[PDB]
Design a protein around this nucleic acid. Structure first.
Ligand SMILES: CC(C)C[C@@H]1CCO[C@@H]2[C@H](CN[C@@H]2C(=O)N[C@H]2[C@H]3O[C@H](CCC/C=C\[C@H]2C)[C@H](O)[C@@H](O)[C@H]3O)C1
Ligand SMILES: [Mg+2]
Ligand SMILES: [Mg+2]
Ligand SMILES: [Mg+2]
Ligand SMILES: [Mg+2]
Ligand SMILES: [Mg+2]
Ligand SMILES: [Mg+2]
Ligand SMILES: [Mg+2]
Ligand SMILES: [Mg+2]
Ligand SMILES: [Mg+2]
Ligand SMILES: [Mg+2]
Ligand SMILES: [Mg+2]
Ligand SMILES: [Mg+2]
Ligand SMILES: [Mg+2]
Ligand SMILES: [Mg+2]
Ligand SMILES: [Mg+2]
Ligand SMILES: [Mg+2]
Ligand SMILES: [Mg+2]
Ligand SMILES: [Mg+2]
Ligand SMILES: [Mg+2]
Ligand SMILES: [Mg+2]
Ligand SMILES: [Mg+2]
Ligand SMILES: [Mg+2]
Ligand SMILES: [Mg+2]
Ligand SMILES: [Mg+2]
Ligand SMILES: [Mg+2]
Ligand SMILES: [Mg+2]
Ligand SMILES: [Mg+2]
Ligand SMILES: [Mg+2]
Ligand SMILES: [Mg+2]
Ligand SMILES: [Mg+2]
Ligand SMILES: [Mg+2]
Ligand SMILES: [Mg+2]
Ligand SMILES: [Mg+2]
Ligand SMILES: [Mg+2]
Ligand SMILES: [Mg+2]
Ligand SMILES: [Mg+2]
Ligand SMILES: [Mg+2]
Ligand SMILES: [Mg+2]
Ligand SMILES: [Mg+2]
Ligand SMILES: [Mg+2]
Ligand SMILES: [Mg+2]
Ligand SMILES: [Mg+2]
Ligand SMILES: [Mg+2]
Ligand SMILES: [Mg+2]
Ligand SMILES: [Mg+2]
Ligand SMILES: [Mg+2]
Ligand SMILES: [Mg+2]
Ligand SMILES: [Mg+2]
Ligand SMILES: [Mg+2]
Ligand SMILES: [Mg+2]
Ligand SMILES: [Mg+2]
Ligand SMILES: [Mg+2]
Ligand SMILES: [Mg+2]
Ligand SMILES: [Mg+2]
Ligand SMILES: [Mg+2]
Ligand SMILES: [Mg+2]
Ligand SMILES: [Mg+2]
Ligand SMILES: [Mg+2]
Ligand SMILES: [Mg+2]
Ligand SMILES: [Mg+2]
Ligand SMILES: [Mg+2]
Ligand SMILES: [Mg+2]
Ligand SMILES: [Mg+2]
Ligand SMILES: [Mg+2]
Ligand SMILES: [Mg+2]
Ligand SMILES: [Mg+2]
Ligand SMILES: [Mg+2]
Ligand SMILES: [Mg+2]
Ligand SMILES: [Mg+2]
Ligand SMILES: [Mg+2]
Ligand SMILES: [Mg+2]
Ligand SMILES: [Mg+2]
Ligand SMILES: [Mg+2]
Ligand SMILES: [Mg+2]
Ligand SMILES: [Mg+2]
Ligand SMILES: [Mg+2]
Ligand SMILES: [Mg+2]
Ligand SMILES: [Mg+2]
Ligand SMILES: [Mg+2]
Ligand SMILES: [Mg+2]
Ligand SMILES: [Mg+2]
Ligand SMILES: [Mg+2]
Ligand SMILES: [Mg+2]
Ligand SMILES: [Mg+2]
Ligand SMILES: [Mg+2]
Ligand SMILES: [Mg+2]
Ligand SMILES: [Mg+2]
Ligand SMILES: [Mg+2]
Ligand SMILES: [Mg+2]
Ligand SMILES: [Mg+2]
Ligand SMILES: [Mg+2]
Ligand SMILES: [Mg+2]
Ligand SMILES: [Mg+2]
Ligand SMILES: [Mg+2]
Ligand SMILES: [Mg+2]
Ligand SMILES: [Mg+2]
Ligand SMILES: [Mg+2]
Ligand SMILES: [Mg+2]
Ligand SMILES: [Mg+2]
Ligand SMILES: [Mg+2]
Ligand SMILES: [Mg+2]
Ligand SMILES: [Mg+2]
Ligand SMILES: [Mg+2]
Ligand SMILES: [Mg+2]
Ligand SMILES: [Mg+2]
Ligand SMILES: [Mg+2]
Ligand SMILES: [Mg+2]
Ligand SMILES: [Mg+2]
Ligand SMILES: [Mg+2]
Ligand SMILES: [Mg+2]
Ligand SMILES: [Mg+2]
Ligand SMILES: [Mg+2]
Ligand SMILES: [Mg+2]
Ligand SMILES: [Mg+2]
Ligand SMILES: [Mg+2]
Ligand SMILES: [Mg+2]
Ligand SMILES: [Mg+2]
Ligand SMILES: [Mg+2]
Ligand SMILES: [Mg+2]
Ligand SMILES: [Mg+2]
Ligand SMILES: [Mg+2]
Ligand SMILES: [Mg+2]
Ligand SMILES: [Mg+2]
Ligand SMILES: [Mg+2]
Ligand SMILES: [Mg+2]
Ligand SMILES: [Mg+2]
Ligand SMILES: [Mg+2]
Ligand SMILES: [Mg+2]
Ligand SMILES: [Mg+2]
Ligand SMILES: [Mg+2]
Ligand SMILES: [Mg+2]
Ligand SMILES: [Mg+2]
Ligand SMILES: [Mg+2]
Ligand SMILES: [Mg+2]
Ligand SMILES: [Mg+2]
Ligand SMILES: [Mg+2]
Ligand SMILES: [Mg+2]
Ligand SMILES: [Mg+2]
Ligand SMILES: [Mg+2]
Ligand SMILES: [Mg+2]
Ligand SMILES: [Mg+2]
Ligand SMILES: [Mg+2]
Ligand SMILES: [Mg+2]
Ligand SMILES: [Mg+2]
Ligand SMILES: [Mg+2]
Ligand SMILES: [Mg+2]
Ligand SMILES: [Mg+2]
Ligand SMILES: [Mg+2]
Ligand SMILES: [Mg+2]
Ligand SMILES: [Mg+2]
Ligand SMILES: [Mg+2]
Ligand SMILES: [Mg+2]
Ligand SMILES: [Mg+2]
Ligand SMILES: [Mg+2]
Ligand SMILES: [Mg+2]
Ligand SMILES: [Mg+2]
Ligand SMILES: [Mg+2]
Ligand SMILES: [Mg+2]
Ligand SMILES: [Mg+2]
Ligand SMILES: [Mg+2]
Ligand SMILES: [Mg+2]
Ligand SMILES: [Mg+2]
Ligand SMILES: [Mg+2]
Ligand SMILES: [Mg+2]
Ligand SMILES: [Mg+2]
Ligand SMILES: [Mg+2]
Ligand SMILES: [Mg+2]
Ligand SMILES: [Mg+2]
Ligand SMILES: [Mg+2]
Ligand SMILES: [Mg+2]
Ligand SMILES: [Mg+2]
Ligand SMILES: [Mg+2]
Ligand SMILES: [Mg+2]
Ligand SMILES: [Mg+2]
Ligand SMILES: [Mg+2]
Ligand SMILES: [Mg+2]
Ligand SMILES: [Mg+2]
Ligand SMILES: [Mg+2]
Ligand SMILES: [Mg+2]
Ligand SMILES: [Mg+2]
Ligand SMILES: [Mg+2]
Ligand SMILES: [Mg+2]
Ligand SMILES: [Mg+2]
Ligand SMILES: [Mg+2]
Ligand SMILES: [Mg+2]
Ligand SMILES: [Mg+2]
Ligand SMILES: [Mg+2]
Ligand SMILES: [Mg+2]
Ligand SMILES: [Mg+2]
Ligand SMILES: [Mg+2]
Ligand SMILES: [Mg+2]
Ligand SMILES: [Mg+2]
Ligand SMILES: [Mg+2]
Ligand SMILES: [Mg+2]
Ligand SMILES: [Mg+2]
Ligand SMILES: [Mg+2]
Ligand SMILES: [Mg+2]
Ligand SMILES: [Mg+2]
Ligand SMILES: [Mg+2]
Ligand SMILES: [Mg+2]
Ligand SMILES: [Mg+2]
Ligand SMILES: [Mg+2]
Ligand SMILES: [Mg+2]
Ligand SMILES: [Mg+2]
Ligand SMILES: [Mg+2]
Ligand SMILES: [Mg+2]
Ligand SMILES: [Mg+2]
Ligand SMILES: [Mg+2]
Ligand SMILES: [Mg+2]
Ligand SMILES: [Mg+2]
Ligand SMILES: [Mg+2]
Ligand SMILES: [Mg+2]
Ligand SMILES: [Mg+2]
Ligand SMILES: [Mg+2]
Ligand SMILES: [Mg+2]
Ligand SMILES: [Mg+2]
Ligand SMILES: [Mg+2]
Ligand SMILES: [Mg+2]
Ligand SMILES: [Mg+2]
Ligand SMILES: [Mg+2]
Ligand SMILES: [Mg+2]
Ligand SMILES: [Mg+2]
Ligand SMILES: [Mg+2]
Ligand SMILES: [Mg+2]
Ligand SMILES: [Mg+2]
Ligand SMILES: [Mg+2]
Ligand SMILES: [Mg+2]
Ligand SMILES: [Mg+2]
Ligand SMILES: [Mg+2]
Ligand SMILES: [Mg+2]
Ligand SMILES: [Mg+2]
Ligand SMILES: [Mg+2]
Ligand SMILES: [Mg+2]
Ligand SMILES: [Mg+2]
Ligand SMILES: [Mg+2]
Ligand SMILES: [Mg+2]
Ligand SMILES: [Mg+2]
Ligand SMILES: [Mg+2]
Ligand SMILES: [Mg+2]
Ligand SMILES: [Mg+2]
Ligand SMILES: [Mg+2]
Ligand SMILES: [Mg+2]
Ligand SMILES: [Mg+2]
Ligand SMILES: [Mg+2]
Ligand SMILES: [Mg+2]
Ligand SMILES: [Mg+2]
Ligand SMILES: [Mg+2]
Ligand SMILES: [Mg+2]
Ligand SMILES: [Mg+2]
Ligand SMILES: [Mg+2]
Ligand SMILES: [Mg+2]
Ligand SMILES: [Mg+2]
Ligand SMILES: [Mg+2]
Ligand SMILES: [Mg+2]
Lengths: 48, 275
RNA sequence: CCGAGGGUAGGGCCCGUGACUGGGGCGAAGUCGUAACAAGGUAGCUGUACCGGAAGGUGCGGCUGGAU
RNA sequence: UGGGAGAGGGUGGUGGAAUUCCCGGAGUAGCGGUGAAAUGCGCAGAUACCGGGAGGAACGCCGAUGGCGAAGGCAGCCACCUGGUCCACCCGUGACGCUGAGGCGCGAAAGCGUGGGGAGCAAACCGGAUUAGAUACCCGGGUAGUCCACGCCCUAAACG
RNA sequence: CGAUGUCGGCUCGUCGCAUCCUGGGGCUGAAGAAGGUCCCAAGGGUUGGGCUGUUCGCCCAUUAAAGCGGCACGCGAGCUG
RNA sequence: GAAUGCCGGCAUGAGUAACGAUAAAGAGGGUGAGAAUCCCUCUCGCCGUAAGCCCAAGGGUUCCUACGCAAUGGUCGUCAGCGUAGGGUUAGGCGGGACCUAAGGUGAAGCCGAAAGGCGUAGCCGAAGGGCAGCCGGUUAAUAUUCCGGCCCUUCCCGCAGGUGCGAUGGGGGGACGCUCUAGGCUAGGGGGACCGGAGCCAUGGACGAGCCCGGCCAGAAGCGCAGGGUGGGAGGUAGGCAAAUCCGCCUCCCAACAAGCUCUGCGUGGUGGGGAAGCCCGGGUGACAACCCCCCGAAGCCAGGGAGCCAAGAAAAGCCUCUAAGCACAACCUGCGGGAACCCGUACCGCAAACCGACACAGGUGGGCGGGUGCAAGAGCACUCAGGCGCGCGGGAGAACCCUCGCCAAGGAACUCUGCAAGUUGGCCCCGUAACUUCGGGAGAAGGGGUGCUCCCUGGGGUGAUGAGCCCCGGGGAGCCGCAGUGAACAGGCUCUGGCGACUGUUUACCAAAAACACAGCUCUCUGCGAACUCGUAAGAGGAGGUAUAGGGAGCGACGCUUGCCCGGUGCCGGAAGGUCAAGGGGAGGGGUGCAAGCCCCGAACCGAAGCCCCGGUGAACGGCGGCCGUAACUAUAACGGUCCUAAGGUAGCGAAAUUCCUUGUCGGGUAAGUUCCGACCUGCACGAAAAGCGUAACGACCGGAGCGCUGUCUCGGCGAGGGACCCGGUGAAAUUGAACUGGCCGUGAAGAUGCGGCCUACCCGUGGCAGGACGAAAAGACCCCGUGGAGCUUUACUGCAGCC
RNA sequence: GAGCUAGCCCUGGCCAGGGUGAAGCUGGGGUGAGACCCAGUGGAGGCCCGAACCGGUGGGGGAUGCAAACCCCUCGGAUGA
């Protein structure tokens, strides 16, 4: 049947993207936390 | 004159439709329309704030002239009468001798080709607009402003009217369509006559899908719901109300008055509605 | 080929009968009340409506085939 | 052809009396109701009186033993649209008449559908009396309905 | 109770005997025929249908007879549900 | 040494199940160490509204070539979407951007919020919508509307000429719109040709033929032709289009009007440029100077912004055209022609799937376009087939039980069973014919029947064409032929009678309920006079609604018909300027602490003093509620009638053993041989009853009952047959479970059901196919039941608070 | 976190073929005029049959699955809420 993951590059970028994150207080704490942890990537990769 | 159908489907048994016989023009005036932005009953938060809305036919808004003191003294000709999907009334296309064009809501009796005019001096004729003080007592009147220069507010839907009862200083006394008696300032404008399309109330929607076309989504009874949802929700089997009948939010809904007690407009309301 | 008739399927009129049910007729001395004939004790009758154990009562309008 | 009387019919308008309710004022201990009462209403200011307002329904006197209509039925006053009918004159047609199974139309009240309207009245209903009872008669309330539009119903002591 | 699946049916049997029939007896208020009552006997047999989820029970048509009980009210790692 | 402990390793089950659609294979020849599995050829089968082809998304090198086979591939592997390396994606016109706006988002101004932040007209962003210029063919191992060829076109810059009051983000026009149905004319696409071109072929009995087999086009600027769209021209006035305006709108007058003209599209033609089969020979070469023509069918596509009808009344903005304002009129803009200029990103490949979403090369899921022919009434249905693509990444045998999926069956025909569950039957089209009842539509495909192929002959009408021929479409009559059978295969209703419920079409518990549930038109009550009520938000601000009582919120009921009774004492809500109670506050009789005192400081009665509550009324389609005992008729029985207690009032009409009736399978009647169900009645209704509506109701239902006919492997009662498994052999090889085991029966015993204890009996050691009685077999720390001063949802006249309202 | 699912908003797309035959309109009849009747035309509808597409009624299979909801047969809607 239709499963839950239906990839869509625009959707991915507009929801989880670096700019979406910078716009809200909580998104910035995400960026700050994944920085402090040392994540190689702070935000999902989409081809664009 | 509502029109019937032969019972050739279960729903055509009872369906009635308007006759559309006063209509003389069947596409609107390009310069006077704009898109009517549908809401679904959602507010600027996106939350439903009026349940069960959405899904109706697409519509354009037709700008209606609810002031008419905009153009004192300038007569206009009744060019056309048109269907308006944003209101129960029909609407009348007006060509002013100016060249300006404008819609009004179409009074009862109004014929294409006649002239109407607005102002303190206009004739007392179906279609004219005067401040209330200059309209003789007993006149049936529609599209009444409620405060001067603020726009016509009262008696706008199909078939309605207000009646001028008496005068008192700067105010006149109107009997509104609800039967309330109210003081409305004499400088408030009003249009002579009743609103047209009086047969509107006798239309039988006839099928569920027709409510859908109007943007009315199905209404769910509280008695059908659960207690998380509604005072009347719950119960094994059917259940009577079991408490004073109530709204989803818990206030009582059989009798409980709701006009704010200390409202300044009370001084101008002589007598609440009847019946 | 047509053909008595036999078979299949579906209708129409009639007759008989049927748990139960509707009033109707009749029947020497049953029970309830007293509507009508006298102004019958609320003049009567009446078409209709609604109501009531029952006759009946009341509304509306009609008639005199009503008294004084 | 000329004239007549008439609540004949339909539409629109509109005029005063009365009842009810609302507002103001003035006033106080009862009002109402009956065979007698009681229920009801009233000092939270009624009844009785004066002024203003709203709204519906019916048109006093004239009015008659009257008038008009085929019948049912028709009554303030006004305009309009319309039927019947009679008289005069003796002009026109030249029996073109009478009745009329079916058919079609009209048809008090009540009642029914859809809107409206709702003052007074009032089936149903509630109450108070009366009574052995009183699902009545009398009294206090009161909903359909009584009114308007359109559509049905088609009955009668629709009788002379 | 860190689970011993529960009513009825179906299928498959197997056992007890306080025996429904068939076999053998005694008594009879046993003439015969046919019954009643008790004793011995478990080898074999013990039908089909209508109603109900039913077990049971009632009924229809038969039969020599249409037995009553146990097996976790036998049988869901065999089925049904 | 135990914690269903934690991490890791390794066992058992076991050479066991399985190897992923039952579309299917066989042989020859190659290659190689090795071949059912790679390549090639021949034969066979499968898809063909796809299992073929093209877009979009998503994926991201998977593409092509060489070299590989450890692992990945459910087996093998020389092969591969695998490993290594090299190569491969070319645009002014295709798609996106340097254009436009939609929802939405963001946001000068501005508003609001302890902070963070929330709003917000303009404006800006935002597309699969608008707008905009490229078609055909060839080339590569791999890209192509991108390279190349041919023929076309767009914008920008600059110049020449010619024309004009030029000029904008401002005004205006246009852009610009629905649903159904649809005319004419074309095009795509298709069928036929006795005509045109072609390598050939004559077989096995016949055919050298008007034979068979193959093919008979594509793109094209101007001009021209056919078919369509869009559009009146002039004058005078002018106060409106937030400045101006010669434009637009509005009034007038004259002329033009089913037209025409102008303009813009589509189709045809068109200079010219391409393509071009079978077959044969080694993707290529030939065919080939290839031929390229006639007729028929014909779109849902095109002309298009076409036409009609309808109600539910159908985006915006830019491009573009026109008007003018500053300005400027040496400019500028319009037209024509010439030269020059024209950027960024994508482009490989997969794409109904082995490359995307599902952990897998997973029988599942994934939007748009094309989707050929024949016959079957039509069609995208079905069967077979074209082009093209496949045989589904384990095979070889055998021919047991048993399971799956399938075919048939004597006599019987529902006897099966909770139930005809399941499977039969029926089955398309044409014609005849068709009942109760009904809201007049319907019920209806009611039921039930007859016809159906082929051949000859005669004949009616239509489309194209020409009025004819030919081709094509609808028929009509007669006479025949064959078979068991003519919708000869495939696709394709079983029917009726009668109840319950719900009017109806719809909706639902994604993944155990599709229903009688929810919704529904319709009915009623109630709130709301607009800065409405109500809702979301601390607020600003939104929705309501750019609506206004014929409207908006809430609530119950649920098409329609006939109806909807009595109770207002309690609760609710509505009304009541009196009375009672009533907080802060007012008032301050009278006290008190302290101080020499002036004073300072505290307590404080009467009385005035909101809402609420009390109190007086109203109100049921507001919450609700609608009696008991005893007596009585000239047979008996039963009570129309009476008595008395109680109530706020004592259940009306209608219905009734009911989706409600306990006793109960009530009783009677019907249907049956037989009927706890069913239907019809009765009424002592345990415990119906009137908008949590009462009683009916045509039509409707994958709803739940009862009966009958038809027909059956459901059954008496089973038999045989097919294929996929099971079984054997080669290859690959799991799983839960598992204290260890050298693991029999009886009768006892035991913590009360023993392989393991006692006594007896029985029993050589080890497997394979099978069956399920036991190992209180596995699975899951019982979901029932209790217990814990465990949890959570929900309710209220439990307590206590809070929002909100007064 | 609404790339699943529920609702709404904006903008697009899709629904083979066949059947039934409403209103209106035309003509005829009818009447004083009418209503109304008859035939033709017409092409309505939460109309009918049936693909695509959307569903998920009954049974069977599957049940360490092809699959953490699938497969076969059957069945509902298919111009509309
Ligand atoms: C009067 C009765 C209520 C008495 C009651 C009957 C219920 O069961 C029995 C109780 C007594 N214990 C039984 C039980 O728990 N049995 C369970 C079974 O659950 C699976 C089978 C399917 C589920 C059925 C039963 C559940 C409860 C599982 O496979 C079985 O091993 C078994 O665990 C008594
Ligand atoms: Mg889903
Ligand atoms: Mg995307
Ligand atoms: Mg996207
Ligand atoms: Mg997205
Ligand atoms: Mg976001
Ligand atoms: Mg972002
Ligand atoms: Mg912050
Ligand atoms: Mg910060
Ligand atoms: Mg790094
Ligand atoms: Mg992140
Ligand atoms: Mg109708
Ligand atoms: Mg009708
Ligand atoms: Mg109209
Ligand atoms: Mg516009
Ligand atoms: Mg809005
Ligand atoms: Mg917003
Ligand atoms: Mg937001
Ligand atoms: Mg709401
Ligand atoms: Mg809503
Ligand atoms: Mg409105
Ligand atoms: Mg309108
Ligand atoms: Mg005012
Ligand atoms: Mg209405
Ligand atoms: Mg609408
Ligand atoms: Mg509604
Ligand atoms: Mg509802
Ligand atoms: Mg509920
Ligand atoms: Mg519920
Ligand atoms: Mg919730
Ligand atoms: Mg709660
Ligand atoms: Mg609650
Ligand atoms: Mg409740
Ligand atoms: Mg409930
Ligand atoms: Mg209940
Ligand atoms: Mg419930
Ligand atoms: Mg109730
Ligand atoms: Mg209750
Ligand atoms: Mg409540
Ligand atoms: Mg009011
Ligand atoms: Mg014979
Ligand atoms: Mg006696
Ligand atoms: Mg009398
Ligand atoms: Mg008497
Ligand atoms: Mg008397
Ligand atoms: Mg009398
Ligand atoms: Mg009475
Ligand atoms: Mg008093
Ligand atoms: Mg006083
Ligand atoms: Mg009034
Ligand atoms: Mg004479
Ligand atoms: Mg009458
Ligand atoms: Mg009357
Ligand atoms: Mg009394
Ligand atoms: Mg007495
Ligand atoms: Mg009244
Ligand atoms: Mg008389
Ligand atoms: Mg237990
Ligand atoms: Mg365990
Ligand atoms: Mg247990
Ligand atoms: Mg267990
Ligand atoms: Mg059996
Ligand atoms: Mg003897
Ligand atoms: Mg024996
Ligand atoms: Mg035995
Ligand atoms: Mg039994
Ligand atoms: Mg029993
Ligand atoms: Mg018995
Ligand atoms: Mg014997
Ligand atoms: Mg036993
Ligand atoms: Mg026992
Ligand atoms: Mg027991
Ligand atoms: Mg047992
Ligand atoms: Mg058992
Ligand atoms: Mg089981
Ligand atoms: Mg069992
Ligand atoms: Mg078991
Ligand atoms: Mg077992
Ligand atoms: Mg077991
Ligand atoms: Mg230990
Ligand atoms: Mg473990
Ligand atoms: Mg542990
Ligand atoms: Mg561990
Ligand atoms: Mg290790
Ligand atoms: Mg391990
Ligand atoms: Mg290991
Ligand atoms: Mg070992
Ligand atoms: Mg092993
Ligand atoms: Mg082996
Ligand atoms: Mg094994
Ligand atoms: Mg396995
Ligand atoms: Mg497998
Ligand atoms: Mg298959
Ligand atoms: Mg198969
Ligand atoms: Mg082979
Ligand atoms: Mg090989
Ligand atoms: Mg090999
Ligand atoms: Mg193979
Ligand atoms: Mg090969
Ligand atoms: Mg095909
Ligand atoms: Mg990937
Ligand atoms: Mg390998
Ligand atoms: Mg190897
Ligand atoms: Mg290998
Ligand atoms: Mg491997
Ligand atoms: Mg695999
Ligand atoms: Mg090799
Ligand atoms: Mg490449
Ligand atoms: Mg180019
Ligand atoms: Mg640039
Ligand atoms: Mg954006
Ligand atoms: Mg775009
Ligand atoms: Mg081109
Ligand atoms: Mg337009
Ligand atoms: Mg528009
Ligand atoms: Mg558009
Ligand atoms: Mg429409
Ligand atoms: Mg072409
Ligand atoms: Mg063709
Ligand atoms: Mg060409
Ligand atoms: Mg001007
Ligand atoms: Mg060639
Ligand atoms: Mg050549
Ligand atoms: Mg199409
Ligand atoms: Mg078009
Ligand atoms: Mg058009
Ligand atoms: Mg806009
Ligand atoms: Mg200047
Ligand atoms: Mg100059
Ligand atoms: Mg120019
Ligand atoms: Mg640039
Ligand atoms: Mg490419
Ligand atoms: Mg698929
Ligand atoms: Mg596709
Ligand atoms: Mg692939
Ligand atoms: Mg595979
Ligand atoms: Mg797959
Ligand atoms: Mg072809
Ligand atoms: Mg066909
Ligand atoms: Mg295969
Ligand atoms: Mg396949
Ligand atoms: Mg074998
Ligand atoms: Mg066969
Ligand atoms: Mg047989
Ligand atoms: Mg039979
Ligand atoms: Mg038979
Ligand atoms: Mg049966
Ligand atoms: Mg068939
Ligand atoms: Mg019948
Ligand atoms: Mg019939
Ligand atoms: Mg019938
Ligand atoms: Mg019937
Ligand atoms: Mg009929
Ligand atoms: Mg038939
Ligand atoms: Mg024939
Ligand atoms: Mg033949
Ligand atoms: Mg069928
Ligand atoms: Mg239903
Ligand atoms: Mg339902
Ligand atoms: Mg019902
Ligand atoms: Mg009904
Ligand atoms: Mg439907
Ligand atoms: Mg569930
Ligand atoms: Mg479910
Ligand atoms: Mg689930
Ligand atoms: Mg299911
Ligand atoms: Mg359910
Ligand atoms: Mg269903
Ligand atoms: Mg539901
Ligand atoms: Mg319904
Ligand atoms: Mg109703
Ligand atoms: Mg109402
Ligand atoms: Mg709130
Ligand atoms: Mg708030
Ligand atoms: Mg705050
Ligand atoms: Mg608004
Ligand atoms: Mg509402
Ligand atoms: Mg409902
Ligand atoms: Mg309904
Ligand atoms: Mg009460
Ligand atoms: Mg009261
Ligand atoms: Mg009360
Ligand atoms: Mg109150
Ligand atoms: Mg107070
Ligand atoms: Mg109660
Ligand atoms: Mg009570
Ligand atoms: Mg009654
Ligand atoms: Mg009964
Ligand atoms: Mg019943
Ligand atoms: Mg009951
Ligand atoms: Mg019972
Ligand atoms: Mg019982
Ligand atoms: Mg019985
Ligand atoms: Mg019987
Ligand atoms: Mg019965
Ligand atoms: Mg009884
Ligand atoms: Mg109930
Ligand atoms: Mg009923
Ligand atoms: Mg019914
Ligand atoms: Mg009826
Ligand atoms: Mg249904
Ligand atoms: Mg159903
Ligand atoms: Mg049957
Ligand atoms: Mg069998
Ligand atoms: Mg076999
Ligand atoms: Mg062997
Ligand atoms: Mg091996
Ligand atoms: Mg392996
Ligand atoms: Mg051991
Ligand atoms: Mg051992
Ligand atoms: Mg052993
Ligand atoms: Mg052993
Ligand atoms: Mg024991
Ligand atoms: Mg033992
Ligand atoms: Mg042992
Ligand atoms: Mg031991
Ligand atoms: Mg031992
Ligand atoms: Mg021992
Ligand atoms: Mg031992
Ligand atoms: Mg021993
Ligand atoms: Mg032994
Ligand atoms: Mg073996
Ligand atoms: Mg074995
Ligand atoms: Mg076992
Ligand atoms: Mg066991
Ligand atoms: Mg155990
Ligand atoms: Mg066990
Ligand atoms: Mg489990
Ligand atoms: Mg635990
Ligand atoms: Mg436990
Ligand atoms: Mg558990
Ligand atoms: Mg549970
Ligand atoms: Mg317990
Ligand atoms: Mg405690
Ligand atoms: Mg404790
Ligand atoms: Mg607790
Ligand atoms: Mg809690
Ligand atoms: Mg708080
Ligand atoms: Mg409130
Ligand atoms: Mg998605
Ligand atoms: Mg669309
Ligand atoms: Mg469709
Ligand atoms: Mg037909
Ligand atoms: Mg026709
Ligand atoms: Mg027409
Ligand atoms: Mg339909
Ligand atoms: Mg059909
Ligand atoms: Mg299924
Ligand atoms: Mg589904
Ligand atoms: Mg089945
Ligand atoms: Mg499962
Ligand atoms: Mg399936
Ligand atoms: Mg199927
Ligand atoms: Mg269908
Ligand atoms: Mg269709």
């Amino acid at each position: 049947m239709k499963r839950t993951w239906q990839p869509n590059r625009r959707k991915r970028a507009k929801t989880h993207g670096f700019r979406a994150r910078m716009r809200t207080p909580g998104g910035r704490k995400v960026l700050k936390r994944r920085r402090q942890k040392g994540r190689w990537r702070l935000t999902p990769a989409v081809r664009k | 004159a509502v029109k019937k159908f032969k019972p050739y489907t279960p729903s055509r048994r009872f369906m009635t439709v308007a006759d559309f016989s006063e209509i003389t023009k069947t596409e609107p005036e390009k310069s006077l329309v704009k898109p009517l932005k549908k809401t679904g009953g959602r507010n600027n938060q996106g939350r439903i704030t009026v349940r069960f809305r959405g899904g109706g036919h697409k519509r354009l808004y037709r700008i209606i002239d609810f002031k008419r003191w905009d153009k004192v003294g300038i007569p206009a000709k009744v060019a056309a009468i048109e269907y308006d999907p944003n209101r129960s009334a029909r609407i009348a296309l007006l060509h002013y001798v100016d060249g300006e064009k404008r819609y009004i809501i179409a009074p009862d009796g109004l014929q294409v080709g006649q002239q109407v005019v607005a102002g303190p001096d206009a004739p007392i004729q179906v279609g004219n607009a005067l401040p209330l003080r200059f309209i003789p007592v007993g006149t049936v009147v529609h599209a009444v402003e409620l405060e001067p220069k603020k726009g016509a507010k009262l008696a706008r839907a199909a078939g309605t009217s207000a009646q001028i009862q008496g005068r008192e200083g700067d105010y006149v006394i109107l009997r509104l369509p609800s039967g309330e008696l109210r003081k409305v300032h004499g400088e408030c404008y009003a249009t002579v006559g009743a609103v047209g399309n009086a047969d509107h109330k006798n239309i039988v929607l006839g099928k569920a899908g027709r409510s859908r076309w109007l943007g009315r989504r199905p209404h769910v009874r509280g008695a059908a719901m659960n207690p998380v949802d509604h005072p009347h929700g719950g119960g094994e089997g059917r259940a009577p109300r079991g408490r004073p009948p109530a709204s989803p939010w818990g206030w009582q809904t059989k009798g409980l008055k709701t006009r704010k007690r200390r409202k300044p407009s009370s001084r101008f309301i002589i007598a609440r509605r009847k019946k």
